Symmetry: C4
Subunit: 329 residues, 4 copies
């Protein structure tokens, strides 16, 4: 995956690339997501039957080809003319869920029409009733899950964007339109307004994970927002195992932040994740070769996950979740 | 804050800058203050009401705009012609306490007259009665607290200053005048001579913190003197949580050493500090733009603290003190 | 040993060298084998009788001159015209066992005829009966042990070899011929087909080690395959002490991965290993000076082991196994 | 102390300097002595009476000006024409014990005649009776202690000296003459032959320290021989606290390895050492300015120890031994 980031830097406007790659503050949490994953070592199992190694999972009542979904990333036409439609098509063809962003540069109904059963990421707005209508739009459009982003009461300070003066070009729009901090009351409002599973994205505290289950969430994403919100927030991968134990199967526990390979997916699943989100790498593939580049990234990731699982002695993702790990230096 | 240190290095005499930036010996403790803060990760809380995020604290019976005060730094006219008056004015306007140094290049009565209710840092002198008169002067002048510096029985060996031959220029004076090691007896002498809270600055041992409370101190500053006294002294941030537990609310527990951002203030408060002191960065802003530069530093710090608190789910500094942390590598 | 790797890089084709030196993926496990050994510190014992320091061990009923054997490395004619015969001769003369590889560039019967009682590494094939005939060939040829490689259900992804397009030259053959994942059933099939001790190579999980003893294995090699299989697999040296305790003498426990000196052998034995395997360094000596270069490597290693043991106060390898260690940074 | 090492490198023959500076093998233990000290942080005490800060200790019935002695270093005329007489004179004038080496380039009776009550380091020889006569010579000459070196059954492999071909020049002699591994029997032979305290140098195992007390030793030096014997031996400073607790005052516990400052002496004493040995820095001062250079090094070290103790709140070395420490990264 390191290959295509080189290709993405060359073709992208230098300040668009930094909007994609950057974190908040000193980017301590952005770097820590990677160091956290690199400290994790897997204890593989040997000599088990690998007749039918399968990377498939069931999540929110639907099968997925991989323990993975495309993370919500706003304004995907910043990276390629086809934007979200290109990514959604490749995700659909790969059997991987795709999270439609509230700030998508193509309307959510259009992305949903691509099929491949997508998810919708909600930013709490203005008034409750606009937010809830956005939820209803997503559900009417056949979205399968509401990914409620809970770690953005406001945008963290991106020192890359203040020093770049970066601003939305004229050709990139918030196609869903023509904000406010979310609370547990907002979560209950969404939950009461939809039959779709509500997935809280940006959970890092063990008791926030427990309360998420109590609040009726169908899932959480253990995430420090790719190091883009609180600078110095603990990496999600560092809280994952604790959160998995506290939740005790009460909801799906996803994780994101620095997933760069099938080996990283294996590490995440061995720490207990149901699935991972992948953000920045999907955008590199988009900016370097559009829908075909995304589809190839997903193919390579699919192959790496399958390879890592077999070398670890895991015929299923469930077996991968039962692997032990050891922390290194 | 890294921006202005560049600006301060350019305008300051190279040996004045090193007097400001340096530590003792190999500067192991100076570096360790920063590494200690960078190892601390905050576990943010989500979805809490942030209607009225306030960074204000009460300390020594008075409200402060931020959990922060300006640290005592001697001879501030070494950095800018207006010296302590410039810093005291900006601190007052920012709602932040200002510690008048015993070795101030402007008399303490003048700095106190600026208003904004200041603190006085005491170096134990010569004879008890000169030290106590200095205390009485500070109290007569309306100073709010005596910050008794307890970690300087004598100056640590600054290898930057011996190799520079650095000495006070002719235009910088100890305006309060026309020393000796402090003991617990000296502390009791001060305490008996003043109704002001006595704050012991330079406490690193848990039992020194307990004894400080027993001795009647109103506060302590957990501090290795910015790495300028004992080289190899533990960083204050590394002892803070232990000291907070041992004191059990018996006095205010401040910390200093390497605070460079609002995120660092959040980390300090999450470890249990009542407030932080900020030293070197305040002098950079002073040397780069005088009173206006200090005021802007305090404004930026105030904004960073507010941002960090909200992203961490803390509406008040008290909630920030209840945040959990996790140590990284 | 660092000297000759320089010599091996100069004379080897740059892509043959990388086939030898490389790991899978990001080579995180290849590097970790070395960092794991470098973190280990030995607590030497003083003032013990060193009259007859001996580095000899008994393993699989036979004496060996050193707690060491040559690791299975395929296609040794890739490194020198005499290939496996050169290494086998030097190993025999050094009193060190030599593991014949299933993919040897010289038939196993020829290598076995060199004498010095060798071992045979088995890759599970195609059909059970071809694999078992290969086992019978090895036993008929006087091989002393079947080293069943259990961590290669398939080859890990060598990013050095995909980026090199590396492929077997025309002059290098799989001389034993004219594959499939191994399971515990395959292990039982081998065990039932031979009176030779079966040694499972590639065990990293404590319960795989216990099951190996239960399955009738005569030994295991605690190994992540030199970092060439699962990228991110824990280093064998990091699991060695735990595995030794769990096995409780039930079988021989060997270790490999990054052994580069007699000091490393001492560390391995102090962690509890019966013996180590040495792979890449033996090939460097082969590519730099053929049989004479291998013999000199084994002589230097033999001297370093003897020196390290004496400085540690160990007259025998058994005493070296009772040494304590301490982990550093 | 870093200043004079620069001066020593310039004036010394490049291969003489490496004989002085080098360790065995990869020099992992040489480096680890320094990293071990740098990880140690002292928790200073405040506000204690420092009326009469004294760095003096009693050891082996005699007062010393500092918790320090000059370590045995062979062939001191390799570094300066006056050799051991220059160092012994400065040590005497500094009130610091001086260890006469068995391989001194000036006879032990001459060094002893300098006065300042010296120690004698014994290498076990040839036959018991030559070793015991060397002991008797030292005692007849007024030496105060026999420092029995127990970690050299033979010389560790100095890779700097094999690659230099370094050999004794014609002008440097083993003036005490005209070897064998030491055992606990050798220790008892010495102990029975002398009324002087026997000090075992090179103890790293806790049970070797306990046995040393049982064997009647008056002291031990916790030491990995400056990283020159077993490469990968644990640093002495890493075993010091454990060894101090196990010995429970039963003998003096000294430590050496990487002591480069008064702060390092403080760290050693806070970990429980009675005193430190200093080796390489004393030779740098000798090679850079002879007796006057050594005397100045001892003066600077004496000042640094006094400074560090006062900043740590210690009026005596005994108080310094009761300081707590904390390990860093
Ligand atoms: C450019 C960009 C935009 C967004 C995000 C991340 C990047 C880099 N993210 C974070 C991702 O969803 C993943 O959490 C993270 O990227 C995983 O890390 P990796 O890139 O290392 O795989 C968003 N999350 C939301 O919920 N809503 C959004 O609008 C979103 O933030 O405003 N837009
Ligand atoms: C130049 C200078 C002068 C002083 C101090 C620090 C510097 C850098 N300090 C230490 C500061 O008060 C903070 O403890 C430290 O600076 C926090 O670290 P940060 O700079 O990283 O924020 C002093 N403390 C006293 O009590 N009395 C003094 O006269 C004082 O020392 O002699 N003069
Ligand atoms: C080029 C090469 C080929 C093989 C192996 C290793 C290298 C480098 N290895 C791994 C070694 O046996 C050691 O485990 C490892 O090299 C120890 O690490 P060190 O080099 O640092 O000493 C093999 N193992 C098998 O069982 N069968 C094989 O065919 C084998 O793999 O396909 N061929
Ligand atoms: C050149 C040299 C020679 C000797 C020693 C050390 C050096 C560097 N040493 C080790 C020192 O006594 C200290 O243990 C070590 O130097 C402390 O470390 P520091 O240099 O960092 O302070 C010896 N020890 C003995 O017992 N007998 C000897 O003949 C001795 O070894 O053969 N000659």
């Amino acid at each position: 995956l390191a290959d295509l980031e080189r290709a993405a830097r060359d073709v992208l406007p230098g300040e668009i690339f930094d909007f994609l790659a950057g974190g908040s503050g000193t980017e301590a949490s952005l770097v820590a997501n990677r160091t956290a994953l690199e400290r994790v070592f897997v204890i593989p199992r040997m000599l088990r039957d690998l007749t039918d190694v399968t990377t498939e999972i069931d999540i929110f009542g639907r099968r997925a080809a991989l323990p993975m979904a495309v993370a919500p990333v706003a304004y995907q036409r910043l990276f390629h003319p086809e934007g979200e439609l290109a990514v959604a098509r490749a995700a659909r063809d790969a059997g991987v869920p795709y999270t439609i962003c509230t700030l998508s540069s193509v309307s959510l109904e259009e992305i949903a029409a691509v099929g491949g059963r997508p998810w919708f990421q909600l930013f709490w707005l203005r008034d409750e009733k606009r937010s809830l209508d956005l939820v209803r739009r997503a559900e009417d459009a056949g979205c399968e899950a509401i990914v409620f982003t809970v770690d953005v009461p406001w945008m963290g300070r991106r020192l890359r964007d203040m020093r770049n003066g970066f601003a939305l070009p004229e050709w990139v729009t918030a196609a869903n339109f023509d904000f406010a901090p979310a609370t547990w009351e907002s979560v209950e409002a969404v939950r009461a307004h939809t039959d779709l599973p509500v997935v809280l994205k940006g959970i890092l505290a063990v008791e926030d994970a427990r309360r998420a289950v109590d609040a009726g969430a169908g899932g959480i994403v253990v995430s420090n927002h790719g190091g883009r919100q609180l600078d110095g927030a603990v990496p999600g991968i560092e809280m994952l195992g604790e959160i998995v134990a506290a939740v005790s199967g009460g909801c799906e526990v996803l994780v994101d932040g620095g997933i760069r390979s099938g080996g990283d997916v294996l590490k995440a699943t061995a720490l207990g994740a149901s699935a991972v989100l992948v953000g920045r790498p999907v955008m590199w593939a988009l900016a370097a070769a559009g829908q075909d580049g995304v589809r190839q990234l997903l193919e390579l990731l699919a192959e790496e996950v399958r390879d890592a699982m077999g070398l670890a002695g895991c015929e299923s993702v469930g077996a991968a979740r039962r692997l032990n790990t050891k922390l290194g230096v």
